[PDB]
Design a protein around this nucleic acid. Structure first.
Ligand SMILES: Nc1nc2c(ncn2[C@@H]2O[C@H](COP(=O)(O)OP(=O)(O)NP(=O)(O)O)[C@@H](O)[C@H]2O)c(=O)[nH]1
Ligand code: MET
Ligand SMILES: [Mg+2]
Lengths: 22, 83, 409, 129
RNA sequence: GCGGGGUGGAGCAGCCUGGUAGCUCGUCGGGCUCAUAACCCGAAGAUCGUCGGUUCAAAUCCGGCCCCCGCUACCA
């Protein structure tokens, strides 16, 4: 679980933060 | 960048416990990457799968799906046969 | 050196290259072996001499060598100028290199096939790319007239004379050829001598040039002691370079620091200059040049600094990541077999920004009426404020021209 | 302005220039041997190696011609798929594109071959392979 | 430019470290079986890319010159 979520949250964050940074 | 096109045979197959599988054969192993293609296709089908020699195999009937996904990627509608 | 750069545009297999064979005698190679079985793929290149038989009758007076005894009589044809071609490919998706090529051109020749239904997907796509960019010196050509009825190459000349009407192309003259057997080519030479005139370029201007190839002269196995330098391949547009001038490339190579990205200018000296198969000491616009260098050929192998631009060392050129395009759109997608209407631009979308000879991709942050700001991946060296640009999208797996405009700094 | 053109058109145009024997196919373990691959290629004016290179590349198999004009393809192929890929050859390399005669020579230059009919007088250019 | 291969018709071993050219198939003949090239037996057939050297002797070791396929790349 919290492994999952942390990396899902991180990937969401990055990918989206990539989309914001871009 | 490159090009290359090939004759594509798609059909239902057979695996162990569990359902049938879908074979996609007939891609040019020099030019085309079955490993990049197949990662893309397992995403479309949502099935596990592999590159089995010069073929991609996808667990379950995905035959209309894949042809519809292969033609999108810029492959010829006229080289593809679902059997 | 060649005085001027002429395109040969058109649809796939309409015989653009075969018409560069019948004028220059030079084949593009048709290479990569995959081009030897496909067709031309990297930008071809070929030069020749255009004299004129003064002592005889035109168009057959228009020679290729110093030899007039071919037509009328001997009086060795006064040399008018030396020229060079740039053969773009004809296949739909090799759109992104033909655009790239079009940053170098002073004029063009549209090769339509006499044995196919006239407005063919790329024939048009190219044409409006021409009308867009500003290459207003066009000559249309009807190529394969050796395999058709004498009615058929006329009825098509109707279809061309009617398309070429509401568009800008007034008397853009349609010279039927047969690139295969090299018949009626000297009348094409009379066209290109009249209509595609040699422009004036001010040499005092800031040295600027584009790059579209670059090659490792080193054969498989030249020893270290005579390791000749790396070779950048491209065309001067403004100025004139000289042998033994200090220089820089832009945006230049990027570094890697743990996932970071950072391009930077490379410096070197001009080791040698050459045009055709003959080495020169200086170089001027019109023609594609090549510049022997003293930088590591590993840097310029396959065609690594493709899209880059060369300038004076210690010059003033912005290396932008983010850019303000003023722009306009085609009402259709003249390119696809299908004419589906160009949608209006959406933010956070991927588009293929051709600027100069570089073919970059980039993401759209802002969308006004006609002013968009585009973040990029690989930077762009913006040598002026008069940078024409071209705007494509991925419509259906294959990249398509949809709008154009100018670069604003 | 047509009168400049229509003059250039009339000036170019004034510079201008037997069934098929039943291919006998057999099988001998893992070989398919066209008994008359020499006589068949002799009666379309073609070089054994150009019908061989093509019919072999299309098959994706190896072979060489015997010492009496016989194709020994090293791969056992049914007696049909050799006709369908030997007709296609005819279509791309012997049948002229003007009147469909089969009565053609095969030109070669640098990198452009031409089908030259002995009946009408035109030239079908072919992808050189 | 380096390789990699070239051998009975065909697939190819053998070449390192030279010393009556092997295999599998096919063919051809006979035999065995009720009839099968299924098995048993035999024959035919490669002066081993090419040209030359060294060696008593080479398919082998050696070097020029070709024929297909990986490596390279349109070489300003
Ligand atoms: N009969 C005839 N054949 C021609 C003529 N011009 C070219 N061909 C043939 O058509 C084929 C294609 O020619 P090519 O020049 O590659 O066409 P292209 O449009 O330049 N190809 P690319 O898209 O790569 O630039 C060649 O094999 C050539 O022999 C012509 O005037 N008449
Ligand atoms: C195609 S490279 C351009 C011209 C160069 N000097 C040679 O060729
Ligand atoms: Mg071409």
């Amino acid at each position: 679980m919290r492994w999952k979520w942390i990396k899902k949250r991180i990937r969401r964050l990055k990918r989206q933060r990539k989309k914001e940074r871009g | 960048i490159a090009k290359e096109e090939q004759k594509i045979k798609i059909y239902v197959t057979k695996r162990r416990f569990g359902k049938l599988m879908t074979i996609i054969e007939g891609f040019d192993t020099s030019v085309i990457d079955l490993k990049e293609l197949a990662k893309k296709l397992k995403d479309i089908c949502a099935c596990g799968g592999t590159v089995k020699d010069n073929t991609i195999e996808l667990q379950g009937d995905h035959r209309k799906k894949v042809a519809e996904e292969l033609v999108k990627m810029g492959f010829s509608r006229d080289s593809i046969e679902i059997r | 050196q060649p005085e001027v750069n002429i395109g040969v545009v058109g649809h796939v297999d309409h015989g653009k290259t075969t018409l560069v064979q019948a004028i220059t005698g030079i084949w593009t190679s048709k290479h990569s072996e995959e081009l030897k079985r496909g067709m031309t793929i990297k930008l071809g290149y070929a030069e020749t001499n255009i004299g004129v038989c003064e002592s005889c009758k035109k168009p057959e007076a228009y020679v290729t060598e110093p030899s007039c005894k071919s037509c009328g009589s001997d009086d060795e044809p006064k040399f008018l100028r030396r020229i060079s071609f740039i053969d773009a490919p004809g296949h739909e998706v090799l759109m992104a290199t033909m655009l790239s090529g079009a940053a170098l051109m002073d004029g063009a020749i549209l090769v339509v096939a006499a044995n196919e239904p006239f407005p063919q997907p790329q024939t048009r796509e190219h044409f409006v790319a021409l009308g867009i960019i500003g290459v207003k010196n066009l000559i249309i050509v009807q190529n394969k007239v050796d395999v058709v009825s004498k009615e058929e190459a006329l009825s098509q000349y109707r279809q061309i004379k009617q398309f070429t009407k509401g568009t800008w192309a007034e008397n853009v003259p349609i010279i039927p050829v047969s690139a295969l057997h090299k018949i009626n080519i000297d009348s094409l030479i009379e066209g290109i001598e009249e209509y595609i005139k040699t422009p004036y370029r001010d040499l005092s201007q800031k040295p600027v040039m584009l790059v579209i190839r670059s090659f490792d002269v080193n054969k498989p196995g030249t020893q270290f002691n005579e390791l000749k330098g790396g070779v950048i391949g491209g065309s001067i547009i403004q100025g004139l370079f000289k042998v033994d001038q200090e220089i820089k490339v832009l945006p230049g190579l990027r570094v890697e620091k743990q996932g970071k990205v950072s391009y930077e200018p490379i410096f070197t000296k001009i080791s040698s200059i050459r045009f055709g198969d003959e080495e020169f000491k200086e170089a001027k616009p019109g023609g594609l040049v090549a510049i022997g260098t003293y930088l590591d050929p590993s840097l310029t192998k396959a065609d690594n600094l493709l899209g880059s631009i060369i300038t004076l060392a210690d010059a003033e050129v912005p290396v932008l990541w983010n850019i303000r395009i003023k722009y306009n759109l085609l009402e259709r997608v003249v390119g696809a077999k299908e004419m589906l209407k160009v949608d209006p631009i959406r933010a956070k979308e991927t588009l293929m920004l051709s600027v100069g000879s570089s073919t970059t991709l980039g993401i759209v942050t802002s969308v006004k009426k006609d002013e968009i700001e585009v973040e990029l991946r690989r930077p762009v060296a913006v040598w002026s404020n008069n940078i024409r640009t071209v705007i494509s999208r991925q419509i259906a797996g294959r990249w398509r021209m949809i709008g154009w405009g100018l670069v604003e700094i | 302005s047509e009168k400049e053109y229509v003059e250039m058109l009339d000036r170019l145009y004034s510079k201008l220039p037997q069934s098929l024997p039943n291919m006998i196919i057999l099988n001998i373990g893992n070989t398919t041997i066209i008994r008359n691959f020499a006589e068949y290629c002799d009666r379309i004016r073609r070089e054994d190696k150009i019908c061989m290179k093509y019919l072999l590349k299309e098959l994706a198999a190896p072979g060489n011609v015997d010492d009496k004009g016989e194709l020994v393809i090293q791969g056992k192929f049914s007696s049909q798929v050799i006709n369908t890929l030997m007709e296609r050859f005819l279509k791309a390399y012997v049948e002229c594109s003007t009147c469909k005669s089969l009565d053609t020579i095969l030109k070669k230059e640098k990198k452009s071959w031409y089908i030259v009919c002995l009946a009408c007088g035109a030239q079908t250019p072919v992808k050189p392979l």
